[PDB]
Amino acid sequence: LDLELADKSEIAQNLNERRREMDVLEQKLSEALTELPEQRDIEELLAQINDIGKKSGLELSSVTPGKESVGGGEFFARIPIKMTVSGNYHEIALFLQEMANMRRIVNVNNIKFDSAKLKNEKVVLQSEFQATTFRFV
């Protein structure tokens, strides 16, 4: 009994170290197929996107999920998320680099931004970044 209780803590810690890194690379390339819940990892992704947006000073004008890419992989359905935040160039580079330093699976790819003021009377950059996570099939 008492040695098995040692094995349980050892392998639970090894599981945590997985999640910690196997997820992260599920952003880099992507990773396995899955055991995945990720049902318990998408709303936290939206929430943390909102948080890194707030601490970067950006107004999150719209976050829009996507459709899973049924033909975007045999071992994974990619869900893309299009984020729409406005502010300063320094602050949007900040927002992007923070999402690219996150512990979750938000691989940012195609980026855009432009000056949101018609007449151009004050500096302001509306920014739309595309960033996706890879659930299983």
Binding site: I11, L25, K28, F113, N120, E121, K122
Partner: protein, 166 residues
């Protein structure tokens, strides 16, 4: 005993199923990050020249007026356009004046890449600076152009206007 030992054979079955897939992932990905450089390549910088010195495969149009230069360009990502924009200046611009050159850009009558925002007349307040010789007004625009099945650029098209010094 026989309960939790089974628990542990399962949890370690996971940990191994885990550990072997990770090493194929790091590798497949490192390939992927070589390939994204292999699609930025044919568009970006080192890849047509002939000594790897800038500007190279590069930035597009240059047009001056002996007070400011209104350039038109393309960079690798949110990074090299950030390196380039940092190397110049960063400004809070305010009361912009509209002039007949803007409409000549809307008219297409002055030949340029109307991916670009317009303008070249305003009043500037410094936010950050790096070149004491350059007052960049702002990264006027930037759009990552992906391409199609006929070919890539994937890079970030952009436009900047900057009054130098002297």
């Amino acid at each position: 005993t026989k309960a939790r030992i089974a628990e542990l054979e399962k949890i370690i079955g996971e940990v191994k199923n885990i550990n072997t897939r990770k090493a194929e992932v790091e590798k497949k990905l490192a390939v992927l990050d070589a390939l994204r450089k292999g699609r930025s390549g044919p568009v970006r910088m080192m890849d047509a020249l002939a000594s790897a010195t800038p500007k190279k495969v590069w930035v597009k149009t240059f047009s001056e007026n002996n007070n400011a230069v209104s350039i038109d360009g393309s960079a690798v990502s949110h990074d090299e356009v950030a390196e380039f924009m940092r190397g110049l200046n960063g400004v809070v611009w305010t009361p912009k004046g509209m002039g007949r050159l803007v409409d000549r850009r809307r008219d297409s009558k002055t030949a340029r890449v109307e991916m670009l925002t317009s303008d070249a007349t305003i009043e500037e307040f410094p936010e950050a600076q790096v070149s004491p010789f350059f007052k960049n007004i702002d990264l006027q625009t930037a759009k990552q152009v992906g391409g199609a099945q006929v070919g890539v650029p994937i890079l970030v098209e952009f436009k900047i206007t900057m009054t130098s010094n002297y």
